[PDB]
A paper describes a structure:
The human leucocyte antigen (HLA) molecules, encoded by the major histocompatibility complex (MHC) region of the genome, are cell surface glycoproteins responsible for the presentation of both endogenous and exogenously derived peptide antigens for immune surveillance. Notably, residues 97, 114 and 116 contribute to the E pocket of the antigen-binding cleft, whilst residue 116 also contributes to the F pocket.
HLA-B*58:01 had the most shallow C and D pockets and B*57:03 the shallowest E and F pockets. Instead, due to the reduced E pocket volume caused by the Ser116Tyr substitution, these residues deviated by 9.7 Å and pointed out of the groove. For all allotypes mutation of the P7Lys to Gln had marginal impact on the Tm (<1 °C), although the P9Phe to Trp mutation showed a trend towards stabilising all complexes (+1.8–2.5 °C). Despite this, HLA-B*57:03, like HLA-B*57:01 and HLA-B*58:01, was more stable when in complex with peptides containing the bulky PΩTrp (compared to PΩTyr or Phe).
Residue numbers in the entry:
A (entry chain B): 1 to 97
B (entry chain C): 1 to 9
C (entry chain A): 1 to 276
Amino acid sequence: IQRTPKIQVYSRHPAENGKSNFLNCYVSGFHPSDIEVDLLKNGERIEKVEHSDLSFSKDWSFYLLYYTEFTPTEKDEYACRVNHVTLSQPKIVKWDR
Amino acid sequence: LSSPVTKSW
Amino acid sequence: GSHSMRYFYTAMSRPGRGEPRFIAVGYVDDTQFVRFDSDAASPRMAPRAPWIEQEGPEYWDGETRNMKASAQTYRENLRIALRYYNQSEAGSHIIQVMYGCDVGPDGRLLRGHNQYAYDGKDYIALNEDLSSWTAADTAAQITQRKWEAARVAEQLRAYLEGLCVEWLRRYLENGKETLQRADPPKTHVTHHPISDHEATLRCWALGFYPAEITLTWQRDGEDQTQDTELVETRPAGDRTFQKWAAVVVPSGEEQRYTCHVQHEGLPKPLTLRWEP
């Protein structure tokens, strides 16, 4: 009836401090389609994050890629915050190189 | 090219 | 290789918040090429790949018309479905559609698909014969009787065997630089001790297209399917995909583990190990 999102946080290219890259949050396997996704830099919401057009898998579950340009450093902490009807509170997944 | 056939359920 | 064209429709009702949203996307293999969103400021079928942009005004206008007509029909279908399942008008519901064709290397139809869901569950599906139906429940049986009466299956077959295959071939030719190019995965193994007597071996595949791939860990030549953590294949955002497979091994036994990679872009399957 309702399916909770799987979440992956990762970079487009292998992370190299000081080199420009893309931060991705891929949310998948969820139903229904409404979902709230934020990319966080040091706990704060990144602006103007883009995302792919809504589509779904063979089991009818939805997937979306949220992405933003970023330049990784040693100190800065990145995460993805997801809320869905199946979640009592937003789930946060930290980016791990 | 999309399907031109869409019928009522 | 072989190829597929696929369209995905999502119609979602939202009582109190206007008419149902209709979103359509089109794909060749793992490459999206068109989109339509009824919530756009100016809703229209729009290009999402460079090789589709060369299609003229007639294409885009025709497709836009078809998408709006489709959207209307699916709003109606949401109402109908409300009736079929004795549901109230207060809840949000979703109709999904996925359809299209698969052709072989010679461009000949391998098979067709035309499948419908309601609230994430199978509703009704055109069988592989492109002439009969499989209904998932009694409501879908009502729909099935309607469509058998109106010979909808014939029209769908006419589309899937004709225009679907023809335009798929056309797209494959126009986008041959990308649609007919496989990018092999760039692979490597990482090693992370988790304790004094255990470590994680992670086999990485990056930058591959299309998405289909197989990563497996073997211990002493035997598949560790039950003990392997396998993440869902994920898009990088540059058309390519990523995947990894991880296994937890006893310290000092790392060299008994081998990662095996199968992908269309590889002339032969790869075997790799942790290289300290």
